[PDB]
């Protein structure tokens, strides 16, 4: 009454209690966040600011 | 012949000892209730006695 | 330059809070002492701190003393009567006697007085202990002769330091058995050797330490194999020395802080002998610290320590730094056969019997002597009969 | 001002007492010390104290609260530049006074505790048995850091500090030749002693003592036996120079 | 409907106790006001539990600053004077000025005004800190205005917070040692990459933050094999911003609770440089909760961190969660000869032996350059000798 | 007796010392030689 949403964190997934993990009440999802590809490196460095001094091709380098 | 700072001189209700009005006359009128009932003379052993074993009894 | 305060004082208003009963108390104790004693006495202390010539006072009075006189009660209706009976100590105390709080004592030889002055606060009953005297070189007198009579009231009890979570406790026991030197069953030629230096400490002139510039102290260590008596020993010792024993009791509580207390504590009896057994219970991490405290740049003197360990090993890591280490076997047949006639078992048995029985007893320890002594008393207390060598057969086995 | 007073100085002079029914008299006899001083003398507590060359004054004025007897410490002065030459006096004071004293820290559990002692038997350097030339530089050190002139020091931007460590199996003169130190030179000695209880906080307050009273010899005995959370902790104190 | 309680009180029992006195010492300081400035000063704090300014007050007082004008005593008899010196600090200070306890002080320019009431009780003397100001625009001016002083009063010092078992210890400290750019002995590749990030920070304006959208704070590891002179560096640097300067000492009482304090405490100083000593020796309990306060969803700005680590293993696992972690590894030649003249081997030697003890001295740490000073000093010092040469080939074996 | 006394330290010939000195005052004389061989025993 009426409803927690919890998000937790780790960089260590091994460390976690297992008792955590696949209930409908406690986390139920889990999702990896890895590094990026490419085109998300490139879509990072274009919101980030680096055209204001690279040019599109040395963006894309 | 050494001077003394404080030179007030007190009258005689200010030598009044805090709280024993109270307490001996409550124990004079305890000593004369229980000369009254028994014809002896009781007399304090202990204003506040700290044994407790005896109190429990 | 402006004062925000204007605020004119009635003179009434200068008056200091507490100062009009008190300063009339204090006149009126002064009044009655020259009443009676016909000098004038001057407060030495108005809520003295020290405690130790305080319970001197209290165990004169209670003890009958001539020496402390009542002077006045200080009100009509507060205790003119108290008794010793605390029911937190280990032996109880009956005596009835006049109050001391509420009470003015004088010791008129001394030219010092006490008087513990009953108030009222949150919301008990509690006192100003004020010290009197009639001039600077009495009450001097009076102070260097605190700790001589605490000195001769120590030799007659035993004092047991017990470390605790806060700190260490103090108790004082009876000497309810006296221990002469013939009663101290061990090796002849340490015994010897040992009393040397007891005798020199506490049972003659102090003149030797001076002669051969010696510092007066001294720390032995009594170690041997397990249920060789070393405890019983150790109080037997302590028992034959005309000077107070004090016992520390290591426990788990144990720290670098109770062994300051302790040693302060037994060093204001001084010339005194502490007894410290099993000091191999004591924490590892203190143990720097308390070699120290016996050998270090800041050690102290004026005490005899006796100390007892089944590790050697682990105390002393030089073996050195106690003055001397001590072995205590088990007893050979003449110690064993010393002990049965100390313990009592000629109640029961011949010479004949006994010289046999210390024959028998081979490997013994004193303990196994004493666990003989009990069960081969209740069969002859029980069955008439003693039956020793089938006790000691028996027992081997 | 009490060890003036106690010891008959002739400054500070009494001048009056508060209360004419308080004490006029104490004693400085504390039986939870270890040195028990008889000395009987005017009170502090009730009186009034003034050192009439140097313009300062001081008053313990008692009063009664919740029945037991407290003081305000008050302090006078007859100018700000007295007043000033006053405190700038006195940790010079102090340091002479420390000169013939031994001043010992032990770590307790809140912190640290200082005591101040006479030596219970003094040791000449004549007694203390060693190769004269260990004897004769160990001492040459200790005698140069203090009374030769610090030319050196200033000249080169070098922190005026040294550290000797002695070493060796128990009993052969270390304990000897440190005692025989508090006599023998014209600064104070300080001994610290390590405990379970000691602290990087314990290190703190030691090193700040220690070093009010520099020019000093400050002593640690069996400095093996600190605890190793602290050891990192008491290196950086040690370079952290106050020359 | 019934009311136990019918007393009827006289309006003289309708009084409120303190507010007499309280009441009568406000309206007279706010009437002195008005007296001397012609404006009226209103009470914004009666107790007020802020410490900042009223130590800025104490300060300025203490400093003869022109700022703060005493304006009255508030009671004839209480102290009209006082002085700095409290002998728990570290540094004393002899400073004799006016009162501030009994003192009402004013910035008329500010429109603000202090008086520190004393009252007597338990039984010390205590006081009311009471702030007063014109009007509401002035009085927050004058908050708005204390941040900016501490900043520049705390360039002009160094910070040293000690963790202990209650909580961290704030020190401040007298720079008694300026430090130029030039007296930075270190790589100099990685000298002008670092010192980009600290002339940004520090030493510029602040647009660039905001133009590129880059968040206003920086953290980076300096770690290397121990004896490198790590420490002196990193003071070094920090020596040379011109901000104020905060060193935490992580101890055995570094907790989560301490580093909050001290994080808080330096934020209040930014921009500031915090210099962290030998992170490594912080608890393992704590470490990941501290990484958090400088990358987390709550973590905050202002701060430039400079950390140092023997085991950069430890601190961040990630190696990587500072921004940049460097490596200071032991002088080359160029960096040994730098030193040489920084540290004065000038003073005994001339150039040729410079650069030719720059050239012999490889594999030597800063430590054991300074070392070899100090024994280079005391020969040219004693023997007006210095053999460099010597020493360094008996200082190598 | 400092022949005899190899391998001691200064505290162990104190502790000589005052065991000889107290047989000494006490017996009339002070057998140093018998006190050295019950110290290494």
Same mark, same amino acid.
């Given at each position: 009454?009426?409803?927690?949403?919890?998000?937790?964190?780790?960089?260590?997934?091994?460390?976690? $209690?297992?008792?955590?993990?696949?209930?409908?009440?406690?986390? $139920?999802?889990?999702?990896?966040?890895?590094?990026? $590809?490419?085109?998300?490196?490139?879509?990072?460095?274009?919101?980030?600011?680096?055209?204001?001094?690279?040019?599109?091709?040395?963006?894309?380098? | 012949?050494?001077? &003394?700072?404080?030179?007030?001189?007190?009258?005689?209700?200010?030598?009044?000892?805090?709280?024993?009005? !109270? &307490?001996?006359?409550?124990?004079?009128?305890?000593?004369?209730?229980?000369?009254?009932?028994?014809?002896? &003379?009781?007399?304090?052993?202990?204003?506040?006695?700290?044994? !407790?074993?005896?109190?429990?009894? | 330059?402006? =004062?925000?305060?204007?605020?004119?004082?009635?003179?009434?208003?200068?008056?200091?809070?507490?100062?009009?009963?008190?300063?009339?108390?204090?006149?009126?104790?002064?009044?009655?002492?020259?009443?009676?004693?016909?000098?004038?006495?001057?407060?030495?202390?108005?809520?003295?701190?020290?405690?130790?010539?305080?319970?001197?006072?209290?165990?004169?009075?209670?003890?009958?003393?001539?020496?402390?006189?009542?002077?006045?009660?200080?009100?009509?209706?507060?205790?003119?009567?108290? =008794?010793?009976?605390?029911?937190?100590?280990?032996?109880?105390?009956?005596?009835?006697?006049?109050?001391?709080?509420?009470?003015?004592?004088?010791?008129?030889?001394?030219?010092?007085?006490?008087?513990?002055?009953?108030?009222?606060?949150?919301?008990?009953?509690?006192?100003?202990?004020?010290?009197?005297?009639?001039?600077?070189?009495?009450?001097?007198? =009076?102070?260097?002769?605190?700790?001589?009579?605490?000195?001769?009231?120590?030799?007659?009890?035993?004092?047991?330091?017990?470390?605790?979570?806060?700190?260490?406790?103090?108790?004082?026991?009876?000497?309810?058995?006296?221990?002469?030197?013939?009663?101290?069953?061990?090796?002849?030629?340490?015994?010897?050797?040992?009393?040397?230096?007891?005798?020199?400490?506490?049972?003659?002139?102090?003149?030797?330490?001076?002669?051969?510039?010696?510092?007066?102290?001294?720390?032995?260590?009594?170690?041997?194999?397990?249920?060789?008596?070393?405890?019983?020993?150790?109080?037997?010792?302590?028992?034959?020395?005309?000077?107070?024993?004090?016992?520390?009791?290591?426990?788990?509580?144990?720290?670098?802080?109770?062994?300051?207390?302790?040693?302060?504590?037994?060093?204001?009896?001084?010339?005194?002998?502490?007894?410290?057994?099993?000091?191999?219970?004591?924490?590892?991490?203190?143990?720097?610290?308390?070699?120290?405290?016996?050998?270090?740049?800041?050690?102290?003197?004026?005490?005899?320590?006796?100390?007892?360990?089944?590790?050697?090993?682990?105390?002393?890591?030089?073996?050195?730094?106690?003055?001397?280490?001590?072995?205590?076997?088990?007893?050979?047949?003449?110690?064993?056969?010393?002990?049965?006639?100390?313990?009592?078992?000629?109640?029961?048995?011949?010479?004949?019997?006994?010289?046999?029985?210390?024959?028998?007893?081979?490997?013994?320890?004193?303990?196994?002597?004493?666990?003989?002594?009990?069960?081969?008393?209740?069969?002859?207390?029980?069955?008439?009969?003693?039956?020793?060598?089938?006790?000691?057969?028996?027992?081997?086995?």
């Amino acid at each position: 009454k009426e409803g927690l949403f919890l998000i937790g964190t780790t960089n260590y997934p091994e460390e976690i $209690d297992p008792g955590l993990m696949n209930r409908a009440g406690r986390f $139920d999802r889990a999702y990896e966040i890895g590094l990026p $590809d490419e085109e998300l490196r490139l879509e990072y460095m274009k919101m980030r600011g680096f055209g204001i001094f690279l040019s599109e091709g040395e963006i894309k380098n | 012949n050494i001077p &003394f700072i404080y030179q007030y001189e007190e009258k005689e209700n200010e030598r009044a000892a805090a709280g024993y009005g !109270t &307490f001996g006359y409550l124990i004079t009128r305890i000593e004369e209730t229980l000369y009254d009932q028994y014809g002896v &003379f009781y007399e304090l052993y202990a204003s506040d006695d700290p044994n !407790t074993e005896y109190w429990e009894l | 330059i402006p =004062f925000i305060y204007q605020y004119e004082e009635k003179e009434n208003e200068r008056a200091a809070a507490g100062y009009g009963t008190f300063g009339y108390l204090i006149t009126r104790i002064e009044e009655t002492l020259y009443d009676q004693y016909g000098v004038f006495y001057e407060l030495y202390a108005s809520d003295d701190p020290n405690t130790e010539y305080w319970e001197l006072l209290v165990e004169d009075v209670r003890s009958g003393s001539l020496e402390p006189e009542h002077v006045a009660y200080i009100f009509e209706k507060l205790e003119k009567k108290t =008794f010793a009976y605390d029911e937190d100590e280990k032996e109880p105390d009956y005596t009835v006697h006049k109050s001391i709080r509420n009470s003015v004592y004088a010791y008129p030889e001394k030219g010092v007085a006490f008087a513990r002055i009953p108030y009222f606060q949150d919301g008990s009953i509690m006192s100003f202990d004020c010290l009197f005297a009639v001039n600077d070189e009495k009450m001097r007198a =009076f102070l260097e002769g605190v700790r001589p009579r605490l000195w001769e009231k120590s030799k007659r009890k035993v004092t047991v330091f017990t470390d605790g979570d806060g700190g260490t406790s103090r108790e004082q026991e009876a000497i309810v058995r006296e221990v002469q030197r013939s009663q101290v069953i061990m090796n002849p030629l340490l015994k010897k050797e040992i009393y040397r230096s007891i005798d020199q400490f506490f049972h003659s002139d102090k003149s030797f330490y001076q002669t051969y510039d010696i510092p007066y102290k001294r720390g032995i260590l009594l170690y041997g194999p397990p249920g060789n008596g070393k405890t019983t020993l150790v109080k037997s010792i302590a028992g034959s020395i005309d000077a107070p024993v004090a016992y520390w009791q290591i426990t788990e509580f144990t720290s670098s802080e109770t062994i300051e207390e302790v040693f302060q504590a037994a060093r204001r009896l001084a010339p005194a002998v502490l007894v410290i057994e099993d000091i191999d219970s004591m924490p590892e991490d203190v143990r720097s610290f308390f070699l120290n405290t016996l050998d270090g740049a800041t050690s102290k003197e004026g005490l005899f320590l006796i100390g007892t360990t089944n590790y050697p090993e682990e105390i002393d890591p030089g073996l050195g730094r106690f003055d001397r280490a001590y072995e205590i076997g088990l007893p050979d047949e003449e110690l064993r056969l010393e002990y049965m006639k100390m313990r009592g078992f000629g109640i029961f048995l011949s010479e004949g019997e006994i010289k046999n029985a210390a024959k028998l007893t081979e490997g013994f320890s004193f303990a196994q002597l004493g666990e003989l002594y009990v069960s081969s008393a209740l069969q002859w207390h029980q069955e008439g009969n003693h039956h020793i060598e089938t006790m000691v057969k028996d027992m081997t086995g």
